[PDB]
Structure 1
Amino acid sequence: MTATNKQVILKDYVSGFPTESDFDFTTTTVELRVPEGTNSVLVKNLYLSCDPYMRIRMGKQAYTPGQPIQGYGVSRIIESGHPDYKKGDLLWGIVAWEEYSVITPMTHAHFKIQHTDVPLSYYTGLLGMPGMTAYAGFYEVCSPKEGETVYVSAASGAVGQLVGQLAKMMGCYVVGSAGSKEKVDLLKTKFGFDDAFNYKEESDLTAALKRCFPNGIDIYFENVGGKMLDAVLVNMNMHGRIAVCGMISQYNLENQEGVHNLSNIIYKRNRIQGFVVSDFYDKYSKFLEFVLPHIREGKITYVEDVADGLEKAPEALVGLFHGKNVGKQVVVVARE
């Protein structure tokens, strides 16, 4: 290996939706040496994650045009130059969209994989940054108690599916919405939710919510926004929490959708708390040692829509925003 290196780049700033045309392919050639830098390691990017924050990251902390779009991925140390990383092991964290990248590890972008008795695809979704985010947001920011109704929202996907699974381990009554009957079956089937509805087979969303929850929503895990939020507010419960994890139904408009119903948080006494996963990474290694018994035991599960190659990685990032993605969108770039 003193190879060529393929990279998926960004042309220029996406207005509205992202499309395959706002991404271009290019070949650099990499020397597999130590290499040149300071606390650097060279790596072979194994897997990539299709992260929805990326849209916000590609409009005019924003990736520079002409340079590969950066994003989370799990990788293997080719050559080292960093104390912690032996010249042959597994990492995850921010990396370029390439086969061969050079990143100098830092404690909260880059973690080090010390459990391989589980897929190295999980560490871009379940045992990776969506997992910390489902752990963090549902445990701290929602502050769940037992027996109480949890509405989850892009539930099939990356963050959504551990929340209803964590919540059902508590023993709540969980419901979840998803866009198609493939995903809405996955929910009650695979992760045994207590109900699940296809929000795209509905006009009556407030009434949809009001039907799925007889006695109202104590907790709502927010992964989407707008219309959905507004029905959830009518539906919310007294002293019930809403942890705002994100708003996919907003990242893409060049005109942000307007919410009405906030007036309800007075009467119903709603905490609405918008977190960020980063802040909880000191609790990462506690999450890991908590879930890792449940996965390899058949208690926590996952579902990941796995593309193959950087070639099929624009057709993949774009797929999140409409909903091609069935579960976590990962991108296999090196099979091992």
Structure 2
Amino acid sequence: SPEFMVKAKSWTLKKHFQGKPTQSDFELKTVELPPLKNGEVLLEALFLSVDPYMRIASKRLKEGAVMMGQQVARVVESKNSAFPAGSIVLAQSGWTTHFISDGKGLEKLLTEWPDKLPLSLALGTIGMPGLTAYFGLLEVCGVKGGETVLVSAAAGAVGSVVGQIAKLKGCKVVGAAGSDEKIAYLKQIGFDAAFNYKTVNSLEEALKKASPDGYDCYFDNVGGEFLNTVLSQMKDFGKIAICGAISVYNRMDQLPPGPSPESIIYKQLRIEGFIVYRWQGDVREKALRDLMKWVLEGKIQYHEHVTKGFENMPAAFIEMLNGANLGKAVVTA
């Protein structure tokens, strides 16, 4: 009988980003949630993800609207038999502490989830970033064993998974990241070579040392000038998997000088863009099962860059874009 009010705090986009996003570009809001109707569920955020795509997606957002994003949430109350109270779901509810859903876009976490594995992994290694790495490496680059893979943003969510999957498939992997701490971490988890792209004397020389015979596949997470230099190091018929281009996300209106036609033509390179969502159904489930299996087998180690508290979400996002994160950037409510 007793009814208790549920307050939902949400992070809104106060002002569109100009260059690097800043705290002031965000505005916290609180709203009293209405009662649950039949077929609806009340969700309470447990772990919220901040991702690079939010920098671009925020452009199609009207100022004042809630920032987009996925989170792991617990069903606190339920009037929907498919999502019982207490169950855990993945929801594209945006940056909010509580959310009422009719169950439409909700995704149940992988069945038989191990107690030892934090639920937040469903937002990284055993989630979208991990799936991105899986399909970009295995399908787009199509590695079969013995090839040499280069991966940028190597100590990041996607990058760290790419390198480890490449290693378990029997490939040689070289990684590029932005800090000495990250480089040490990469060598710890199996990367054959790794270098701090910020402190190189020569990007080209760094790549040459890492792999003298060149690269079979380049999993591109950064684009820009880095991509331009990588093309000269690709093996003939090499493949470039265009996953993202974070180096230009803050300057989409001032794109740097483009790639050289010389390398693309003479080396007959294949460049392909892809989005995780191209893979669905059974193939997507098998990928999740594989990622889970590989984590349980110790083949894919992980690390989460946790930011405590919902009120610190803008900071977690900003800092992730700036490279503060080693592994998946996750925010605990």
Kept in 1, the 8 Å contact 2:176–2:194? The answer is yes
1:99 maps to amino acid: T
Q: How does 1:209-224 map to 2 (within 5 A)?
A: 209-224=207-222
1:170 maps to amino acid: K
1:116 maps to amino acid: W
TM-score, normalised by the number of residues in structure 2? 0.93
C-alpha displacement of 1:294:
2.0
Quick check: 1:199 aligned with 2:197? Answer: yes
Distance 1:96 1:103 in 2: 12
**1:274 counterpart residue number:** 273
Distance 1:67 1:121 in 2: 25
Query: 86, 106, 110: which one pairs with 1:110?
Result: 106
SS, match of residue 278 in structure 2: helix
Distance 1:78 1:64 in 2: 30
**2:165 counterpart residue number:** 166
SS, match of residue 261 in structure 2: coil
C-alpha displacement of 1:83:
5.1
Distance 2:279 2:80 in 1: 24
Query: 219, 231, 237: which one pairs with 1:239?
Result: 237
Distance 1:7 1:175 in 2: 40
Distance 2:106 2:170 in 1: 34
**2:130 counterpart residue number:** 131
Distance 1:82 1:287 in 2: 28
SS, match of residue 14 in structure 1: coil
SS, match of residue 183 in structure 2: helix
SS, match of residue 119 in structure 2: coil
**1:157 counterpart residue number:** 156
What is the count of residue pairs matched by the alignment? 325
Distance 1:87 1:264 in 2: 57
Q: How does 1:289-328 map to 2 (within 5 A)?
A: 289-328=289-328
C-alpha displacement of 1:6:
1.5
**1:188 counterpart residue number:** 187
C-alpha displacement of 1:82:
4.2
Kept in 2, the 8 Å contact 1:13–1:65? The answer is yes
Unaligned 5+ segments in structure 2 are none
**1:28 counterpart residue number:** 31
Kept in 2, the 8 Å contact 1:229–1:259? The answer is no
Distance 1:205 1:178 in 2: 12
Kept in 1, the 8 Å contact 2:152–2:222? The answer is yes
SS, match of residue 201 in structure 1: coil
Distance 1:63 1:70 in 2: 9
Distance 1:284 1:83 in 2: 25
Moved over 4 A (4+): none
Unaligned 5+ segments in structure 1 are none
**1:69 counterpart residue number:** 67
**1:93 counterpart residue number:** 91
Kept in 2, the 8 Å contact 1:132–1:281? The answer is no
Kept in 1, the 8 Å contact 2:36–2:100? The answer is no
Per-residue CA shift, 1:125-155, capped at 9, x if unaligned? 1111101111111111111121111001001
1:153 maps to amino acid: S
C-alpha displacement of 1:35:
3.2
**1:18 counterpart residue number:** 21
Distance 2:248 2:95 in 1: 25
C-alpha displacement of 1:78:
2.4
Per-residue CA shift, 1:165-211, capped at 9, x if unaligned? 0000011110101001111111011x110000000111411121111
CA 1:104–1:158: 2 relative to 1, 3 Å: farther
**1:44 counterpart residue number:** 44
1:285 maps to amino acid: E
